Design a protein around this ligand. Structure first.
Ligand code: A1I60
Ligand code: A1I60
Ligand code: LYS
Ligand code: LYS
Lengths: 468, 468
C-alpha cells in the first residue's frame, strides 16, 4: 500500500540521473517463446547465441555477486535471467532500481542453469511499475479480476488462455463462413428504430440531427436488406445492445453472429450450424470430447437430435397439444404444475422438455405468435419454420426459414404493435425492401458468449475481456 | 405508382389458386455465374446439362409461343431464359403472373440463342415483387440511392462492385495483420467515460444500472490495457461513435482500425502502415496505379516521403518556427495570411504545407499540447513522436510511439480537464493500468471510409452500405 510511494520515488530519481524508465525503444531481438523454441533441449549447465529479450520481472532472487529473476513475456512464456559479465554499478542499479512487475530488457548469451536463462551483457528498464502485482493468492475475487482485467492477464495463466481462446473461436468462425463463401458485411449500429428481436433499446440523442437514435438490438432487418440487394451469402459478427437486465446468460452488450443464406431452409442452416460449431471446437479447442470444470466430458461429435416443440411437449404433458389448444387449457396445465398461446407453449416446453435435455438438440416448429419474422411452416398449420439449438443446456442459436412475404410480414408487425400500444408506427423501409422481393433464404443467430460458455463451462463474466 | 396495386392483386390471386409466390424452398442447383463458367464458349445456337437456376427478372420480351427474359443473379451475372417444351397453361401463367423485379426459378437445358440461355422444363415464382424497379435513368439521386441501398444494389452495377470492394478491403486488412501475428480483440462499446480521442460522446441511459453510459469514441485506452495485459500485437477493426457534425470526411458512426505493437516506435508503425495499405490495394484493387473518376491515375507504389511539421512549416512561412515560438507570434502570422500554441502550429501547417501535398506523405514530430496520449520525442524537445499519413490529400492514418509514463500521462489529462472545466475527474482506471507498467509500444489509427476514399475517389456516402 505504501510501496506505491517508493516506486514513484524510484521513477523520479531515475529521471534525475538521466536513466530513462520509459524509453521509446529497446532493441528486443526475440520473444521469449522464440528463444525457447530455439533451445528446446540444451545440456543443462552449459551457447554463443546472443539475444535481446524483454519481459516483466515476476520473480526476483538476489545473492551478493549474482541476482536471478524470472522474465515472463506477456503470453506467459518464461525465461530466467542472471544479472563479472558487466558492471558492479550495474548490479547495484539492478538491486536498487528493479522491483516486481517491472518490464526489463536484457541483452546477452543464452545458457542453462544448474532452467533456460540469459546471462546479461547489458540490461535496461523498459517500464517502471508504480504498483506491485497482487500475490494473487489472495485469489483475486471474481469482480476484481473483471474490473482489472489487465492485472488478471498478468497474474493468472487461465485468464491468458481464455482471452486467446475467444479470439481463436471468433477467427475459427470467420474462417468457416468464408470457406463456405459467406461475405462479412457492416450494417448500422445507430438506427432510427431498432428491430430484428424482442428487447428494449438503448437510446442516444444526436447533435447533428437533433433527434433520438437507437442502438441496434440485432442486424437482421439490415442483413435482410442485403439479401434483397443480391447478396447470396452474408454474415455479421459484432456487438448488439439490449437495454435490459444482466444474468448468467444475458448482458446488455454482447457479440452475436448472424448468417443469411439464399435458397436454403431452416433444415439447411441447421446442418451448417452444427458443422460450424464442430469446426470451431476442432480449430480452437482441438477436441469434440469437451473437458469441463465439472471434471466431466461433453461429447458434441456426431449427429444431433431434432425434436418438434408441440409433439415433444405433448409427450411430456401426456396429452395432444396443437396450435388449436386454447390459452384457457394451457393456463390450466401451467397452473397444475407450479399472456398468449405462443408464450405459454414455449414456456411449458422449456419448463418440461427443455430443462431435461442433455445431448445437443435442435427443437423446431415454433408457435406463429412468438416468431413474427420467420415463415409459416410449409405443410403444418399454425407453426413457423424456426429451430432453437440447445447445447449443454445453454440456448445457443436459432435458425429460420425467413419470411419474405411483405403482406404477411406487415400483419405480423401490426399484431405486435397493437399488443404494446398505450392508446402505431411500423418499420416502413424494411417492409418496402421486402416488397422489392427477397428470395427464399434461411437466417441464423448465435451468441459468442453462449458459444464459449456451452463449449467450456466458463461464466459470461470470463468470456469477455472487459465487462461491467 | 398505381402498379403497386396490380402487383398486390397478383399475389392475392396466386395465393387463392394454391400457387406459392413466396415458397420456402426452390431447388436451385447453380448460381448463374456457375452456369456461365461451365459454358464459356458454347457454339452459339446449339446441350443436355440440365440445371436449376434462380434470378430476378430484369428484362422481359414476350412473343406468342415463346417469351424471353433476363435473369440477373444478385451479383449481377446474367442468364437469359426462354419460356413446346412444357405447358400452354405455363406460358399463359408466365405472361399473366411474371412482372419485372420478380425472383423466378427455372429448371431445364442450357443452350445458346441465335446469348447463354436456359430453355425451361419447369418454372416457378420464388418471390413476387409488389414494387417495380426504378428505370434508374431516372438516375437515382444520391440521397435516394443511400436511403434505398437495396434497390441501388439491384439496379446499378457500381453499387454492387463498391459494396464488394469495401468487403474485400476489410478482409485484406485482417489477412495482412494476421499474417504479421496480430490478434484481433473485442473491447467495450459502452463505457462509463469515453476516451482515446477528442470528441463529444453519444450518451445513453442504462436501465440495469440507472446511470448514463457513453458510446466509445475510440478503443485506444482499452487496447492499451491489453498491452499491459501482455498482448504483444493486437488490433480492433470496428465502429466508433463521435457525436458531432457530418461532412465529406466525417460521419458520427464509422469503422476505424486501431493497431498496437510492443517494442517498436512510430518509425516502425509507419513502415507497416505503408505495407498494409499497399498490400490492400494489391489484394482488393489489383494495382497500385490507382484509377480515379477524375480519369487520372494515383501512384501509391514505392517509398513515401516523410517530412517534419515544424521544419516543413518553417520553410513554408520563411522563418524558423519551433516549440518556443509564442502564441502571439503564431497569431500574427495566422492573421497576416487570412487558442493555444499547438493548435496554431497544426492549423498553419495544414493551411500551408498540408493542402499542397499530392504524393503519399507522412508528417511527423507533433506539438506536445495537441498529442496528450503520445510519448515526448526521444531527442527533440517540445514535440511528440506522432505521424499523420496524407494520401491523395486525405487524412488517412496516425501512428504514435505510445506514452507509457503514468505520471506524465496524468499531467497531460490534468491540463486537458482544466482547459474545458466550467468552475475534474480523470480516467483513473486507465492510469491505474499504466502504473502496472506498459512496455514500449506504437499504436496506429486509420479510417476505413478514408481508406476507400483515398484509394478510389468515392464519397463517404458510397463507401458504407447503409448511412444516414
Ligand atoms: C450474453 O448473450 C446474450 N445476451 C442477451 N442479452 N441476449 C442474448 C444473448 C444471447 O446469446 N442470445 C442468443 C439467443 C439465441 C439466438 C442467438 C442470440 F445471440 F440471440 C440472446
Ligand atoms: C468518416 O471517418 C471519420 N469520421 C469521423 N467523424 N472522424 C474521423 C474519421 C476518420 O477517418 N478519422 C481518422 C483520422 C486519422 C486517424 C484515424 C481516424 F480514423 F481516426 C477521424
Ligand atoms: N435476430 C435473431 C437472430 C437471427 C434469427 C434468424 N433470422 C435474434 O435476435 O435472436
Ligand atoms: N485513437 C486515435 C487512433 C490511435 C492512435 C495511436 N494510439 C484516434 O482516435 O485517432
Amino acid at each position: 500500500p505504501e510501496q506505491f510511494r517508493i516506486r514513484r520515488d524510484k521513477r523520479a530519481r531515475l529521471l534525475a540521473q538521466g536513466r530513462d524508465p520509459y524509453p521509446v525503444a529497446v532493441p528486443r531481438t526475440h520473444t521469449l517463446a522464440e528463444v525457447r523454441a530455439a533451445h528446446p533441449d540444451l545440456p543443462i549447465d552449459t551457447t554463443e547465441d546472443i539475444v535481446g529479450v524483454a519481459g516483466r520481472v515476476i520473480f526476483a532472487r538476489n545473492s551478493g555477486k549474482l541476482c536471478f529473476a524470472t522474465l515472463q513475456d506477456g503470453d506467459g512464456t518464461q525465461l530466467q535471467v542472471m544479472i563479472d559479465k558487466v558492471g558492479q554499478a550495474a548490479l547495484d542499479a539492478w538491486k536498487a532500481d528493479v522491483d516486481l512487475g517491472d518490464i526489463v530488457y536484457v541483452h546477452g548469451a543464452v545458457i542453462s542453469s544448474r532452467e533456460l536463462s540469459v546471462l546479461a551483457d547489458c540490461w535496461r528498464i523498459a517500464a517502471k511499475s508504480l504498483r506491485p502485482l497482487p500475490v494473487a493468492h489472495k485469489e483475486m475475487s471474481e469482480e476484481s479480476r473483471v474490473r482489472q482485467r489487465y492485472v488478471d492477464l498478468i497474474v493468472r495463466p487461465e485468464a491468458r488462455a481464455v482471452a486467446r481462446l475467444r479470439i481463436a473461436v471468433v477467427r475459427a468462425i470467420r474462417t468457416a463462413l468464408q470457406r463456405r463463401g459467406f461475405l462479412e458485411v457492416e450494417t448500422p449500429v445507430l438506427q432510427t428504430l431498432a428491430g430484428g428481436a424482442a428487447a428494449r433499446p438503448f437510446a442516444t440523442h444526436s447533435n447533428a440531427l437533433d433527434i433520438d437514435l437507437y442502438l441496434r438490438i440485432a442486424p437482421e432487418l439490415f442483413l435482410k436488406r442485403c439479401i434483397v440487394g443480391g447478396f447470396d451469402k452474408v454474415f455479421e459478427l459484432n456487438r448488439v445492445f439490449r437495454n435490459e437486465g444482466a444474468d448468467s446468460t444475458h448482458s446488455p452488450e454482447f457479440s452475436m453472429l448472424e448468417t443469411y443464406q439464399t435458397y436454403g431452409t431452416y433444415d439447411d442452416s441447421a446442418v451448417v450450424t452444427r458443422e460450424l460449431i464442430q469446426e470451431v471446437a476442432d480449430e480452437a479447442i482441438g477436441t469434440r470430447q469437451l473437458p469441463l470444470p465439472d471434471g466431466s466430458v461433453y461429447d458434441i461429435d456426431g449427429e444431433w437430435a431434432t425434436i418438434q416443440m408441440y409433439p415433444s411437449l405433448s409427450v411430456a404433458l401426456g396429452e395432444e397439444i396443437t396450435p388449436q389448444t386454447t390459452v384457457d387449457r394451457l393456463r390450466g396445465i401451467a397452473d397444475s404444475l407450479g399472456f398468449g398461446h405462443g408464450k405459454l407453449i414455449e414456456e411449458l416446453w422449456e419448463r418440461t422438455v427443455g430443462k431435461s435435455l442433455s445431448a445437443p438438440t435442435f427443437v423446431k416448429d415454433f408457435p406463429v405468435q412468438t416468431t413474427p419474422l420467420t415463415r409459416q411452416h410449409r405443410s403444418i398449420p399454425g407453426v413457423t419454420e424456426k429451430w432453437d439449438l440447445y447445447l449443454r443446456g445453454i440456448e445457443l442459436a436459432t435458425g429460420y426459414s425467413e419470411l419474405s412475404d411483405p403482406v404477411v410480414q406487415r400483419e405480423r408487425f401490426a399484431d405486435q404493435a397493437r399488443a404494446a400500444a398505450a392508446g402505431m408506427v411500423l418499420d416502413e423501409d424494411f417492409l418496402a425492401a421486402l416488397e422489392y422481393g427477397m428470395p427464399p433464404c434461411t437466417g441464423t443467430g448465435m451468441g459468442i458468449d453462449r458459444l464459449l460458455m456451452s463449449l467450456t463451462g466458463l461464466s459470461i463474466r470470463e468470456t469477455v475481456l472487459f465487462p461491467i
